[PDB]
Design a protein around this ligand. Sequence first.
Ligand SMILES: N[C@@H](CCC(=O)N[C@@H](CS)C(=O)NCC(=O)O)C(=O)O
Ligand SMILES: N[C@@H](CCC(=O)N[C@@H](CS)C(=O)NCC(=O)O)C(=O)O
Ligand SMILES: N[C@@H](CCC(=O)N[C@@H](CS)C(=O)NCC(=O)O)C(=O)O
Ligand SMILES: N[C@@H](CCC(=O)N[C@@H](CS)C(=O)NCC(=O)O)C(=O)O
Lengths: 219, 219
Amino acid sequence: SHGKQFTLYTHKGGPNGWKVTIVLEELGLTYESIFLDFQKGEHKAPEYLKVNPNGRIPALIDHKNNDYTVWESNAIIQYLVDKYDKDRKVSVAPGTNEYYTQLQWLYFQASGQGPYYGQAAWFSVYHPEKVPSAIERYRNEIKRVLGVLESVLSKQEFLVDGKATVADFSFLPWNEGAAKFLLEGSQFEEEFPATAKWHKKLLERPAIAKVWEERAKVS
Amino acid sequence: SHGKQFTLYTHKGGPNGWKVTIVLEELGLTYESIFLDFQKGEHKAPEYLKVNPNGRIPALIDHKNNDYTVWESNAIIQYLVDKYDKDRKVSVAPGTNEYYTQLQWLYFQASGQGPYYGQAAWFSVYHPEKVPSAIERYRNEIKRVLGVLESVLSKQEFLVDGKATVADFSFLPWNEGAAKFLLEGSQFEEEFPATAKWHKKLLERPAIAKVWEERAKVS
Ligand SMILES: N[C@@H](CCC(=O)N[C@@H](CS)C(=O)NCC(=O)O)C(=O)O
Ligand SMILES: N[C@@H](CCC(=O)N[C@@H](CS)C(=O)NCC(=O)O)C(=O)O
Ligand SMILES: N[C@@H](CCC(=O)N[C@@H](CS)C(=O)NCC(=O)O)C(=O)O
Ligand SMILES: N[C@@H](CCC(=O)N[C@@H](CS)C(=O)NCC(=O)O)C(=O)O
């Protein structure tokens, strides 16, 4: 209905739709973003459940692949680079050892960064009572995850050693949350300097900077 | 030294090492399980951090691929089926649409099931303070995830619809937690009958049943 290769179901504020948008833009692909209104329950409405039965964003429909539909941000991202980064600008080749190292880092992001950072967000902002021990638990886990990244990034430039890939990009949106709200003050920058430098440089890439400007705009 | 194709770093009780063991056994692969003693801090010791800097299990070393090492259970699983399930017994082919649907489900498991079930376990069993609102939050999230699975499994046999795959298997260890204590009583079986039946039948597969005996032995 719109002349773009993809329909992307997303959200204006949350990190995970922007994660996919970063990759779409890095790959030079066209997309129509449908921003769901969570306050109106649109992500739980039958119209969206037929797209993603989990009732969460993002979800992607590829109109140049017979409307193939896939959800989970990092599954979407793998689909996008495997099919549409054949020049390997921001990904490694399927069927190589490095591919499974890329995949390892993408799972660490999706299972180790996102959910735990998200529980810090939950207890700090949304939970109906203030539970300092829960807030502290998840802040400490954010710092533990950052420490893992720091242990690697202090010794090599990027996660899949030689070049920036979607494995690196996948951590950006949630780490921007750590930088701006989930940790107090400048703790991200001063406690994890190698990670903070890597993060900053990725955000300055032209496609990522473009997406981040758009995120600020739609807000 | 042990003569097996793989070294698997694991834990006797937690779900995520067993997840990989299921796949190793389904594929008829040989492996030496090294059960780390978390009470002794073995998962945080410098020698294990050289294997997985995250300091969590599982991690896999493939001695028939020049000691290629990969961590994150679902990255390990993908490596194993892509390289060693060319007969497509329990996986779909790389480079197909269905591969990315399999991947979607694997990411839903790793990011949507495991972390959230794990926080139910944390608040119910390990957090110093008993926090009823946190316990309720994660019990409700277990049920929400089970409802997603139910919505699919009540309409088709397996997740990647007609074939049992590692996408289905990946849910087993944490759903066994739901079945046996994380949800009290018979809530799992009564409230999610299609999911419970699918779970039961998967545990009856010969390879998985064998793994479950090992899990019982070491308990
Ligand atoms: N692991 C999922 C997480 C998706 C997720 O957390 N989405 C959020 C927005 S950032 C959402 O839709 N939240 C609505 C809700 O769950 O109520 C992925 O990476 O796609
Ligand atoms: N229904 C959600 C609402 C909040 C939500 O969706 N949070 C997202 C971020 S927008 C989250 O924590 N996602 C986890 C992840 O990214 O893995 C909940 O109860 O946590
Ligand atoms: N997303 C990771 C989760 C791994 C995980 O939670 N491992 C647990 C055992 S079930 C662990 O090593 N826990 C020790 C710790 O974190 O202190 C994966 O699927 O491999
Ligand atoms: N350091 C861990 C200790 C407990 C732990 O490792 N729990 C594992 C299960 S053994 C977990 O919840 N893993 C989450 C997952 O499987 O994604 C924590 O603070 O949560």
